[PDB]
Design a binder for this molecule. Structure first.
Ligand SMILES: [Cu+2]
Length: 23
């Protein structure tokens, strides 16, 4: 997620989805 842009791209998903990689 890049509304909640931890990384602004598409991988390290901190926030909302909690899919695998984070912060
Ligand atoms: Cu994200």
């Amino acid at each position: 997620d890049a509304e909640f842009r931890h990384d602004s791209g598409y991988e390290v998903h901190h926030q909302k989805l909690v899919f695998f990689a984070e912060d």
